[PDB]
Amino acid sequence: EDNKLTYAELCLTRKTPENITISGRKLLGSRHGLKFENMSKIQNYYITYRKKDRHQFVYQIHSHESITRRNEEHNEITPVCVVNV
Question: Where is the protein situated, by its record's location annotation?
């Protein structure tokens, strides 16, 4: 829905972590509907977005471990609904 997302399905030709992130970055750079303004606990790949000044955001897929690592290194990358690859 507008607020919460049920589930996301990604379909590729090969299942590798680098290809998953590349596909998530490329497929989520076109014209989209909303900004995924919600939250859900995470525990494993997810679609995430970081905030950036003057209404700027990036849409790409990160693993939960990678989400934690990039939150530790860094504007937090708040994760949203799970992605099944």
Answer: Host Golgi apparatus; Host endoplasmic reticulum; Host endoplasmic reticulum-Golgi intermediate compartment; Virion
